Amino acid sequence: MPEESSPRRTPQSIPYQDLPHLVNADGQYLFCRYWAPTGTPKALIFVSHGAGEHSGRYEELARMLMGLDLLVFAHDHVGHGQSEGERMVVSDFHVFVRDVLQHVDSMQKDYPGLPVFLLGHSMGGAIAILTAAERPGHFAGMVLISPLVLANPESATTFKVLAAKVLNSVLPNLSSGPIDSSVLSRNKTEVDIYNSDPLICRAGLKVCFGIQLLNAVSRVERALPKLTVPFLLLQGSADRLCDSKGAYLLMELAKSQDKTLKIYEGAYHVLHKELPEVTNSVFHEINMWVSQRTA
Numbered sequence: 001m002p003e004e005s006s007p008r009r010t011p012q013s014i015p016y017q018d019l020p021h022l023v024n025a026d027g028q029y030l031f032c033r034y035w036a037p038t039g040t041p042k043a044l045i046f047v048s049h050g051a052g053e054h055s056g057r058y059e060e061l062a063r064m065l066m067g068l069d070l071l072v073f074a075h076d077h078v079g080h081g082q083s084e085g086e087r088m089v090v091s092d093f094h095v096f097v098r099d100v101l102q103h104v105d106s107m108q109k110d111y112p113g114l115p116v117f118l119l120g121h122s123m124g125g126a127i128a129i130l131t132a133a134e135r136p137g138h139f140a141g142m143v144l145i146s147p148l149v150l151a152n153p154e155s156a157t158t159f160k161v162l163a164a165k166v167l168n169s170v171l172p173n174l175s176s177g178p179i180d181s182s183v184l185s186r187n188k189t190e191v192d193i194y195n196s197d198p199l200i201c202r203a204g205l206k207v208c209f210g211i212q213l214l215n216a217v218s219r220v221e222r223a224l225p226k227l228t229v230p231f232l233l234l235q236g237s238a239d240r241l242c243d244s245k246g247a248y249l250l251m252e253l254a255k256s257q258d259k260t261l262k263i264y265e266g267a268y269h270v271l272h273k274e275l276p277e278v279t280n281s282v283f284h285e286i287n288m289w290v291s292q293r294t295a
Ligand SMILES: O=C1COc2ccc(C(=O)N3CCC(c4c[nH]c5ccc(Cl)cc45)CC3)cc2N1
Pocket: 049, 050, 051, 052, 053, 057, 121, 122, 123, 124, 148, 151, 155, 156, 159, 179, 184, 194, 205, 210, 213, 214, 217, 241, 242, 270, 273
C-alpha cells in the first residue's frame, strides 16, 4: 500500500496544514494572513510587503483597517517569511504580481461583489502598481508607502554594473552587501526590531534578485500611463532606499483622476514604523483616505 508523504512544512519547519495557506501556479505554498471584522466587510484589502520582510510586520496597520470594517488579507511573497522558495530568489518579478492576483481572485470568490483595495510598501508597492496596471478598473484604490518607483540613484548605478557583469558571465552566487538597517527609520527601536526578527532576510542582496528589482522599476515606468486606479502615496523626503523623485514621477505620470501625495519631511523609508509623530500621521491618513472611499 503506498503512503502519503510527510506533511509539507514552512522553511521554519511548521506544517502548512496548520497554517492559512495558498498554493501558487508553480506549486509553491504561500503562507497567508487574514484579519476579518465581526460584521459584513465593506471591502477587501490586500497588504503587500517589501523585500526581505514578511506579512507579520503589518499587524498594526491590518488591525486598524479591520477596525474600519475591511477584511484585510496578505501572504508572504515567494522566497520570503513563512512561504516556500529559496530566500530572496524569484524567477521573474511577475511571479509576485501573478500570486497577488491569484489570492485576490480566490478571496473575491468567498466575498463576491465587494470592492478590493491594495496596500503596498516599497517592493510591495511596485507589486501593487503592477497588479493594478494589469487589471485596469478592477481595484477600488491603492495605498502606497514609499513604493519602489526609483531606487536610490547610487544603488541603481552599482546594480546596473553588477547586472551587466552577472548577465555576461556565470556567477550564480554574486551578491551585494546587506541593506543598511540604520536608513530604514529614525525610530531606533524599529531598527532594532528589524535586526531581531528571524523571519527577515538580512543577507546581502543577490545580483539575480537585484536584476528583478531593476525589472520592477522598468516595468513600473512603462505601467504609469496605464495606471488609472485611485491612490494615496506616502513618501519620506530623506528616503535612501526608494528615492523621493520616484514618488513625484508617479504623481506626474499616472493617469489616475484621484491621486494624492503626502511628503514626510526628514522621514526615512519605513513610514509606518517611523518616529511616532510620523507613524501616527501615516495611520491617520490611510484611515481617512480608505474611510472616504468605502463609506
Ligand atoms: O520595513 C521594511 C524592512 O526593511 C526593508 C528592506 C527593503 C525594502 C524594500 O522593499 N526595498 C526595495 C528594494 C530597494 C533596493 C535595494 N537595493 C536595490 C538595487 C536596485 C533596486 Cl531597483 C532596488 C534596490 C531597497 C528597499 C523594504 C523594507 N521595509
